[PDB]
Design an enzyme around this catalytic site. Structure first.
Site, mmCIF file in Angstrom:
data_model
loop_
_atom_site.group_PDB
_atom_site.id
_atom_site.type_symbol
_atom_site.label_atom_id
_atom_site.label_comp_id
_atom_site.label_asym_id
_atom_site.label_seq_id
_atom_site.Cartn_x
_atom_site.Cartn_y
_atom_site.Cartn_z
ATOM 1 N N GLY A 91 2.426 5.598 9.906
ATOM 2 C CA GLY A 91 3.851 5.572 9.596
ATOM 3 C C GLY A 91 4.557 4.319 10.093
ATOM 4 O O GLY A 91 5.696 4.048 9.698
ATOM 5 N N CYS A 112 3.643 1.262 9.416
ATOM 6 C CA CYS A 112 3.510 0.177 8.455
ATOM 7 C C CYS A 112 4.896 -0.257 7.952
ATOM 8 O O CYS A 112 5.786 0.584 7.806
ATOM 9 C CB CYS A 112 2.595 0.595 7.310
ATOM 10 N N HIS A 121 0.809 -1.218 0.000
ATOM 11 C CA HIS A 121 0.000 0.000 0.000
ATOM 12 C C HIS A 121 0.861 1.297 0.000
ATOM 13 O O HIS A 121 0.305 2.387 -0.036
ATOM 14 C CB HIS A 121 -1.067 0.008 1.111
#
Ligand code: O0R
Ligand code: O0R
Lengths: 304, 304
Positions: free
Chosen positions: A143, A145, A41
């Site tokens: 942030g 991820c 993503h």
């Protein structure tokens, strides 16, 4: 003596953390050998996170659009590919700090250490468990991820988890290192059912054995039970059914304490039916299920 | 969202861990620059641990008697000296992995990360607090002596604790990095009074603010209190008296949530007087005091 929610030393993983930027999105990457792994993503904007067609979105991206920074040095991207929900960015330089590593898919009820990261920089480390409903109760912000979960066997880092998503419930969802989500989750901004969670019975029992080892014995009683009787109680209190495979893994803890596994199940049954009565066990006022039997042996024996 | 007992990433400290042997005793050392710091009881045998005369025992030791191994390489000892309860072994090589560091003496109620070590090798990392009675509730076994506690500000490691002793109660005692014990403890095998411990009120309040931030709001009420009224309650439940310095540090958390500090003290008062009633706050069935207001802001904002 003493018992703590102990995480693995994070150094071997800190050396693998990088920052991945693509378009206007930044998250964490995992640099092992000449490959950077990150949630796919990273190629999305907020508008397409509602229903992303990752294959179509990735088509508009070239190697030069993936900015990978290791500390304050830029890595050159020579290849990109999508494997399930992760992107693998081939870089021209092998990470000089790559430890001996494996990619593993952990089982529900298993525990692991998380190194939470922001912009490729580590902020903290904590121990957590893969819940039976395949979510983790972590501590993650926007942030985070690309932050990974792992275990360490002597010198080998077994990467088991990469963080992807926060559920509307505040629980966390993510993938193994091949991009396969744990659980039914999909990397979409849509409300998704976490499912009923249960208490990891074998882990609670292991933590009760750790409690006996560290002096806490108030909960031990003059009773015993059978797997069938205990499982009637576990069912009622949303505890995972206990099997002979669970009892077998509890053998080392049973041998050390001289308390038969079924005798400890009778203590658990009484604690479930009666509660703690305002008492504590290892500084906890609830039954802890985030220590596996392996964790208890490891912490109680000092395995480095 | 989510809230965890998060430790600092341990990498900068893992690179400083060495093994120190002297006579038949082995423990952990901390290699910073050309100096190895370790507990001075490394020179003792079991017979003299009853009442050791460290000055006299150290006299029988030469530089060549201190075996310092960094991983699998031997460091050469060119100097030795005792500073309070630590030995400083001058080595001929500066640790190439020395981070930016400071030696600090933390205040009671302050928290820090511990990297538990055995034979100079790290086994795990956990977050803990210096109790008001100057003990720590760690997880340590024989061989863990020399393991250090620390904090990290961007790139600088502030070493605050070195582990020395396990009390007969199973709680832990140790020194700052100049060898000064926290508390009244002495490095002797004699039963020593830990003293009455209290709950770190400002930390519980900070954890209540973290709970509100992460959705847990059941404990918030329609009441308020005063510092004097609240302190009558804190006294009764062995909680540290709350001062205006505590309220000032809780300002950022109060501003973020829009809940006045004294309004949160009224929630704490009600929780102390009424208990949890079988409910939980941030996955805990007791009031947690091992997160400072700084820890809560840091975890809730993602400081790396
Ligand atoms: O959840 C996301 C973004 C996202 C949305 C939809 C799908 C996927 Cl795969 C990823 N990131 C995140 C992770 N952990 C904690 C906080 C956050 C941000 C909300 C604050
Ligand atoms: O307490 C000691 C040895 C000792 C004795 C007397 C004085 C001093 Cl400074 C040190 N080491 C230790 C530390 N932490 C946990 C377990 C242990 C061992 C008992 C198991």
């Amino acid at each position: 003596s003493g018992f703590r929610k102990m995480a693995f030393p994070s150094g071997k993983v800190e050396g693998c953390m990088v920052q991945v930027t693509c378009g206007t999105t930044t998250l964490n990457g995992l640099w092992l050998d000449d490959v950077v792994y990150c949630p796919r993503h990273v190629i999305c904007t907020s508008e397409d996170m509602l229903n992303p067609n990752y294959e179509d979105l990735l088509i508009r991206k070239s190697n030069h659009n993936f900015l990978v920074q290791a500390g304050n040095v830029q890595l050159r991207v020579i290849g990109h590919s999508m494997q399930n929900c992760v992107l693998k960015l081939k870089v021209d330089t092998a990470n000089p700090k790559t430890p001996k590593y494996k990619f593993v898919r952990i089982q529900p009820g298993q525990t692991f250490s998380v190194l939470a990261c922001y912009n490729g920089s580590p902020s903290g480390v904590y121990q957590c468990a893969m819940r039976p409903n395949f979510t983790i109760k972590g501590s993650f912000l926007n942030g985070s991820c690309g932050s990974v979960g792992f275990n360490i066997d002597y010198d080998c880092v077994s990467f088991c988890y990469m963080h992807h998503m926060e559920l509307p419930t505040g629980v966390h969802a993510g993938t193994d290192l091949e991009g396969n989500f744990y659980g039914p989750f999909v990397d979409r901004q849509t409300a998704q059912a976490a499912g009923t969670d249960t208490t990891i019975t074998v882990n609670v029992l292991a933590w009760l054995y750790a409690a006996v080892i560290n002096g806490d014995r108030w909960f031990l009683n003059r009773f015993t039970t059978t797997l069938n009787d205990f499982n009637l109680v576990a069912m009622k209190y949303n505890y995972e059914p206990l099997t002979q495979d669970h009892v077998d893994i509890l053998g080392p803890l049973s041998a050390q304490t001289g308390i038969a596994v079924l005798d400890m199940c009778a203590s658990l049954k009484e604690l479930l039916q009666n509660g703690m009565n305002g008492r504590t066990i290892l500084g906890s006022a609830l039954l802890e299920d985030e220590f596996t039997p392996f964790d208890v042996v490891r912490q109680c024996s000092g395995v480095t």
